[PDB]
Amino acid sequence: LTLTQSPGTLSLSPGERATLSCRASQSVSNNYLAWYQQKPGQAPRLLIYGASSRATGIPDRFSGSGSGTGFTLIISRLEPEDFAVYYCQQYGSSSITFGQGTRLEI
Amino acid sequence: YQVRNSTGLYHVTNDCPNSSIVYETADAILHTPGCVPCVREGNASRCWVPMTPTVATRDGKLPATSPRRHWTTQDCNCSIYPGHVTGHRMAWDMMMNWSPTTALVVAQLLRIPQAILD
Amino acid sequence: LVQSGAEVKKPGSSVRVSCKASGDTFKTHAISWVRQAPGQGLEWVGGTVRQAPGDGLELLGGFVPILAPANDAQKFQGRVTITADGSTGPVYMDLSTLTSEDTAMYYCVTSLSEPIPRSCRGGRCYSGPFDAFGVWGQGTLVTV
Amino acid sequence: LEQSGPEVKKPGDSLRISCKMSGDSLVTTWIGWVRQKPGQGLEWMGIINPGDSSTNIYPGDSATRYGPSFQGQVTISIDKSTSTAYLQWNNVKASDTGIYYCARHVPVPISGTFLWREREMHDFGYFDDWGQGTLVIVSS
Amino acid sequence: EIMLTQSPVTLSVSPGERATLSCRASQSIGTNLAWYQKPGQAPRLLIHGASTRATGVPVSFSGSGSGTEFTLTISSLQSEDFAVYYCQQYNNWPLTFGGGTKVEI
Amino acid sequence: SVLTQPPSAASGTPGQRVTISCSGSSSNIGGNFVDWYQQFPGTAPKLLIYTNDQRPSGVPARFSGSKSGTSASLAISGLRSEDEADYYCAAWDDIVNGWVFGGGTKL
Amino acid sequence: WHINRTALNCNTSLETGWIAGLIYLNKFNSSGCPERMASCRPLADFAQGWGPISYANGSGPDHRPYCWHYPPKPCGIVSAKSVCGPVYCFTPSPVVVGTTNKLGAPTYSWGENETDVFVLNNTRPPLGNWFGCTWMNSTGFTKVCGAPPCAIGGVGNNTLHCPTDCFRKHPEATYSRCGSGPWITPRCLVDYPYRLWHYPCTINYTRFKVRMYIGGVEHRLDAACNWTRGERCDLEDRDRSELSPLLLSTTQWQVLPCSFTTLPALSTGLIHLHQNIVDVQYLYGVGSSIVSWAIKWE
């Protein structure tokens, strides 16, 4: 599964809604896609597990959605603290795989 | 163990065939033990609930006391897929909920008001 | 693999050359003997099969040896008998009625895979060719 | 968890990175590793099963499943007496550099149609508690 | 039986160069041969079947064959690995060997 | 079998969280459910976990948690000195058709 | 019993190595099955039967009999000269049978001599003997012998001759009446030491411990079944197993994957299956009540 994460490396003003896409090669079994936020210099933090469940301590700004092969992470009211590298990944039945990741810029 | 003809592919079911049905018109289906009557009320396929191993009604409320008047069908797939039976749960029902007696029968007989209105 | 020491005979004599397997686990492999001529030719002498305890149709009771070795009848023409002492004991190559032309270094080798039968008849199986020789011993010079 | 500090090696030798799974006992704490080469994304390296034979992902045997590039090249193991997870190389290559993250793994139970004997098994999960990431440098 | 003709009989040191050795059978042997090295010592296996390197055998050894003639190629003879090299067959049996090919290296 | 839990809690100061583990086999701790109880010397024990959908009345959120497979645990968040009770792991045992209790963990 | 009762005439005219699986265990070939299985249909793809069950002589093909629907040839005497491996006969359990003369009972010849045969007289087991037998012949081909398969019938041309328990096509076609050879259900066969030699494509047949009761006798069987995790298993996919099952924990019976027994749960009289755990059946239903006969006061 070559998850391709290609919103294109978005550049947003703080307060705008980020729209991060993730395209699966095949269907994601059930909903085993997940999203992470990596601030430069830090280990990535889990944001969303499953297609949309929010992890503890994560702002409501982060909203996951999707099914089949079409998934996304939406960050409403994007804050300066969120201009990190985002990654989608998958934990399905054969293996664990990661996307390339993209950065939110201004 | 009853068999539904379905789509030409036969399969196992617990749904009572008409050949097993005995009935009362007061909402009760009496039947050969080993099945549960399914009633499609109008279209809804709604499964009746056993009160006794051979008797079922619409809601399990123990109602008070010839063409068949029930619209049964081999539909519903009744109690084929119950939830998991926990070892503890089985023991609990066999020790607590389950219960045959005679002293009880006598205590009940001695308390009948004899207002036998039926 | 460890073999016996050096030996010197006069013609008409017999020589017994031993080979003890280096491991403890037997896997239905075969041990063959190769003769090293002073002329640098290598002759296959012969070899046998050492069956693991669970093979040979024990399931049916009894035992069927995988036996036929395709003995060399070109230069040896009989004379050399190769047998195992037991499933765990050493292999012996009994070289009889020898001549000075049989001076050679003698050594054993274990093949890389289990021999597979090609045919079975009656109470015996006939081994197909042994696979490529793998683990070589060092050898003993036997002169006559 | 907390990871060990930075390490530098020459090609060959061996390298070990340890993780201290502090704050809780290993009741059911799974752990694994993720690699990030400088300028790159994340690579799953592998996970290890702290439990018994009942939970070995789906095949039902190996306690250590690895990503495709790590199939025997690197070892992942857990010392249950010291609550420590390890990632180890028995031959360090010049390419094995960058940040190695150690993280708690969160398995997801088996679903769909399966047999009784594997009912307690789990599928691959996700990574929840991440350590800080250690740096490995390999050079001549 | 199966006869194997080994050629060249003797090869020079030709240090650092490539060399090939071959054997030609009287019979159509499948890819079941083996090659051995005998460096003044007891022999060791080089090739398993017509072309698989045996464990411990360096990259310099490779080969191909089938039919009646098989070739052992030894490349980059920088290490003067003196030996008489042998062709051995495992098709029909009693098993046979070629006479060996001496290489001066 | 017999449920196994440690003889003593990690303990520590108030404000600290500790975990009391419990384990067993599929014949008892696995499947079913695992009750947890608190007992102070001198009195009868009372319930904490796997009762009342794991939150019995009168018991603070301080005492909580559960585990999968054949594991179980009690997490105590904030070691108030009033909580220095022995804790027990209990489950239904399907071999003996009765209840099994573990050793008791002392906090 | 003595090993010289086993015929051992093994001739490698082709496919060298086939013989390996006789002497050695776990030396099966296991290759070319995707092609061989191309013609092995699911039970569901056969015409629905109806009417009374009859019987027919299963004079089937000479291709390798590696499919459950293959109709076995009626039994008769088989010469030892054509037999390489041991001969196994199936009653619910495997039975090893040996050589015999037409009249004398033992023939301790290893099957090498003439007039040395396998008797193989069979009539469905509630009376005696076996449902059918399987053995490897002298050139590496598996051959079978067995009871007449059931003539199930149907409206179309793709009707079935059923050697196994074909419940979903005809409700009365039980193993005890239609069985012939080792196939119990279209996806499960009785295991034995040479199963992977005689039926080499039965790789990944997860093994189950089951118990079957025929007539008055229990048989403890090793069942080998085709099952892949994730495989569809709806009610329409479940076959009758005719088992008297072993107990798992305290509440569940061990059944073959996607199958059921006809035995009712103790408390309800009903069949209760699990949706996700494919090979189990509950022995205890949950609903319960008070007997009403006990309170039918006059």
Add this chain to the structure above:
Amino acid sequence: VQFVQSGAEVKKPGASVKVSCKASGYTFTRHAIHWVRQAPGQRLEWMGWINPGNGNAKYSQKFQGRVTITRDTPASTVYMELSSLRSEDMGVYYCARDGGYSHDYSYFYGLDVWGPGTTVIV
């Protein structure tokens, strides 16, 4: 919903003992009454239980040949007898309420109500 035990006993080895729990504050028709033993410093030990009204009772195999329990329904009391003491039996004996099975059959109700505990000295 209190269970009331009465007294405590001291007996020499080989002697029998008897404890009972009267209970009030509930109907005692909708739960089981369990007996649990605890030797000083030891584990809570399961002995067995009784179904009010029906009188149905089960015992741990450990005490199957040693104890019996009954209920005097109109007295709202469960009684337990130990045929003899063997030293190892010293400890506190409690009765407790086995609540319904959550009623909606979710996570079950464990033993929420325990009697004070009676002391048995061998």
